[PDB]
Amino acid sequence: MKEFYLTVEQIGDSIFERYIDSNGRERTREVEYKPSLFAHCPESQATKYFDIYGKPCTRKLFANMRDASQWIKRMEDIGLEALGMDDFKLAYLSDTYNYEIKYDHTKIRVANFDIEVTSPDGFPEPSQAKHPIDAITHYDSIDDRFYVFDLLNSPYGNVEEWSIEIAAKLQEQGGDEVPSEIIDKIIYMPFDNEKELLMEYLNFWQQKTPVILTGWNVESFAIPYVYNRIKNIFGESTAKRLSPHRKTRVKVIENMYGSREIITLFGISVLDYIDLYKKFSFTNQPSYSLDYISEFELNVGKLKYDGPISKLRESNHQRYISYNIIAVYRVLQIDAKRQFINLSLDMGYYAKIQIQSVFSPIKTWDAIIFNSLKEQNKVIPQGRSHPVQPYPGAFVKEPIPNRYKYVMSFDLTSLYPSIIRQVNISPETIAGTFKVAPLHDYINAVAERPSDVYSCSPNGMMYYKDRDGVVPTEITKVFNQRKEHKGYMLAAQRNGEIIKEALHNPNLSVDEPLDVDYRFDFSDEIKEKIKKLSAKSLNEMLFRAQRTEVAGMTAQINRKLLINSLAGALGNVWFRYYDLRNATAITTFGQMALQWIERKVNEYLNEVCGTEGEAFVLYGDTDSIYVSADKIIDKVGESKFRDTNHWVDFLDKFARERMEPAIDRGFREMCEYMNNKQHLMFMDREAIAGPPLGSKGIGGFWTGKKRYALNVWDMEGTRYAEPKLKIMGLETQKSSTPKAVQKALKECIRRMLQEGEESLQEYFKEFEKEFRQLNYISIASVSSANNIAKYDVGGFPGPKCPFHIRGILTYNRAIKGNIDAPQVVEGEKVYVLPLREGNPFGDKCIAWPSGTEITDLIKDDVLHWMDYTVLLEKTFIKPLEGFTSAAKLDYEKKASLFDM
DNA sequence: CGTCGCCGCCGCGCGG
DNA sequence: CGCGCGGCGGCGA
Ligand SMILES: Cc1cn([C@H]2C[C@H](O)[C@@H](COP(=O)(O)OP(=O)(O)OP(=O)(O)O)O2)c(=O)[nH]c1=O
Ligand SMILES: [Ca+2]
Ligand SMILES: [Ca+2]
Ligand SMILES: [Ca+2]
Ligand SMILES: [Ca+2]
Ligand SMILES: [Ca+2]
């Protein structure tokens, strides 16, 4: 096979590399790598190395990496550019793997672990590590086994061995309901003392050294606790055995609030799953406990136990160990679904970076670009110092707040990357500048043509048309990958809707799910078989369809994020190719493109309908437009349609056959105007929205910029079995809004758009009556706990203290002097509740860590003093009044003459 | 060390 | 609750 690296590190003058050899075996080597850097030379000397501007360079080969680094410093002291890859391990990887990397995931050791630490005196601080580690479950991807290390004797209690038999039994049998599919995969090892446990762990770690190290909060907890506990018991050199090269560093993350010291293990790539999940999942959650994320992702119940966790080992060691094992598997199950590890490996190997660098698009793009340029013997520029400067972004149209019955949206495919490709925006393609007219002049096509030679953006920039820049070239490759995966995703989604439809008539039989590839549209043959299947098989197929969809979503949306990050990186000072001329060229062009097509769509539809000056485009944001279709529907007449799907077909056909061709012509004209290198402004129909035929639903409404709701029947070619609410910006979409409130506000909107004013009034009235029965968690707001110490004055709110910080301070006073109460962690999420006047907490609100029940100490008092009225007024009624007034509806029935 | 736009809540200090 | 301004949180692109 083709060799591929596992991990790479620079230690002084040595590259330490772990890799898979041609035989598929893990090896390690130390290389005294001689790096090269470059300096400009006279045009009058022979060379094959040139910078991106075509200036000739001479290669400087160094005896070792430290010499190379010192040369950089001397070049700074002289005042001359030191060119080339100054991250010597990226140069090493480029030299060693001078080909597209084919990796075999089965050869890569992915370790998933978690630890248990019994602690009576509060949260066990990793940097102190003063309490015994009493359980480690370490899953190994290569062995496919859960290795369980269990402490039997501790200063906090001596316990019996864990029973695998009881762990397999149902909870109703007194068991732990450890899923049957992993029972045979548990290798259980009890220990009489913590020393032997840790020594055996390290020996085990030596035999099965993780390449990818993951788990839940392992970077902030498990890793530093294990390292520090071992350091406390045995000394540093023994702790350093967690690194295959025996080197570690104790380092902080730079922020703007506080600091936390994490452990860098040289020769391992740590990908904490919480960090994988936060970057790649495209959610914001009220809580990031594994219980919460597991319930959300997998619909599994919370791990249930009595008393505090600090007493669990003592009271019920059986369950303690089982819940440790189950916690590991749940991360595996989340990954099986989301596929973030797979995504990380893909991106990592593509860029030829340390895998853990996927968290950093700047590092990723820096390495992609460097490899692309090196292939052509081109030399990258030195990174420079730049002051942070604000620059303009997208255009957003101000909508007229109103109901909107029929709506068709259109959206530009991958806007910013396509602008980069169309215009040819790249560091080395800058051709010069032209004299800019006000942007509206370009929008209305009244400004003089920018250039007859070069490709232009209305910010004044000009670019070469003779050849593609490295940015367009490299961004196009990832874009194409993205497109493929989006194709798989949408097809899985369409297939899902076919299964949903079929589920309306399940056939009563014993049968199996069809063996199909969900990434491809179901054939007619498959459709007919599905029409003959039982609910059991259809539901299992739907589950499989939805899993394929999720897999496709992960692959596509994060490649989208990566290509969009290239456009953003051009506006970040740490990017090697930082250039505000290029970042602004993208965004200004975007503002022109949007407003230009607004004009064209308006001009086109006015002609179709025989009017003048009327606005059809009601809204737009960045690259999408929302077109009112009322008049199109009205021109045929609502009476003429058989059912909802019929007018949906009609709008789909009208958008695909009349509007899209007009949109294309309008954009082809803009391309010529700007003299761009390649027409790539592709604006397709996205949504078809409206109320059900014959109903009193309003279809959609806008309250303002980035705030609207639509009743969608068709989204980029996916015809839904049941209409789906597209809601943006409104309170239903915010992680800060109470759960039950999100739910009720969503149902109010559903009723408004699908059913009408009377249905909405019927629901509101019922919610208002029953609201006081809602569980306190379901009605708590959520916020992030930032800068607590800034607003802490003696335990009481300082000047300008935010509401939620006030709540935290109230909580702190209430729990003061209590070792075992959950402390609020700076930066993490809190639930927030209003408190009625004259409560014992001595303030108007209280906040506690999210995802958890509030400590039993103050729960009863919180539940008794919760201010439901404030809750109902602030989180529900005020948002609802905002919706309804915008939609010109009343949520409460107004009095009429009929009341006699 | 991808970006900007822009919403609503809140504290504050008004606003004769 | 009448109002904007700045801080904040949190999405929407
Ligand atoms: C989502 C997102 C968009 N944008 C900008 C760049 C996008 O091109 C532009 C439009 O956003 P989107 O329409 O959400 O995304 P897109 O056009 O790039 O991709 P798609 O084909 O799925 O429509 O807004 C960002 O800068 N960062 C982001 O995270
Ligand atoms: Ca635990
Ligand atoms: Ca788009
Ligand atoms: Ca599209
Ligand atoms: Ca059937
Ligand atoms: Ca869009």
Could you describe the 3D structure shown?
InterPro entries: DNA-dir_DNA_pol_B, DNA-dir_DNA_pol_B_CS, DNA-dir_DNA_pol_B_exonuc, DNA-dir_DNA_pol_B_multi_dom, DNA/RNA_pol_sf, DNA_pol_palm_dom_sf, DNA_pol_type-B, DPOL_T4. Its cofactor is Mg(2+). Mg(2+) 4 binds at residues 411-412, 623. With 900 residues, this protein is of the alpha+beta class. It folds into 6 domains: 1-108 and 340-382, DNA Polymerase, chain B, domain 1 (DNA Polymerase, Chain A, domain 1, 2-Layer Sandwich); 109-339, 2-Layer Sandwich (Nucleotidyltransferase, domain 5); 383-468 and 573-729, B family DNA polymerase, palm domain (Palm domain of DNA polymerase); 469-572, B family DNA polymerase, finger domain (Helix Hairpins); 730-774 and 867-888, Monooxygenase (Up-down Bundle), CATH 1.20.1280.300; 775-866, Ribonuclease H-like motif, CATH 3.40.1820.10. The chain has 25 helices and 31 strands. The strands form 8 sheets. Strands 16, 17, 21, 22, 23, 24, 25 and 26 form an 8-stranded antiparallel sheet that branches. A hairpin with a 4-residue loop joins strand 8 and strand 9 (145-151). The longest helix is centred in the middle third of the chain and has 35 residues, at 535-569. The chain is globular, with a radius of gyration of 31 Å. The protein starts with a strand and ends in a 14-residue tail after the last helix. The structure holds thymidine-5'-triphosphate (TTP) and calcium ion (CA) (5 copies). One calcium ion binds at residues 502, 505, 507, 531-532. The protein binds a DNA duplex (16 and 13 nucleotides) through helix 12, helix 17, helix 18 and helix 25.
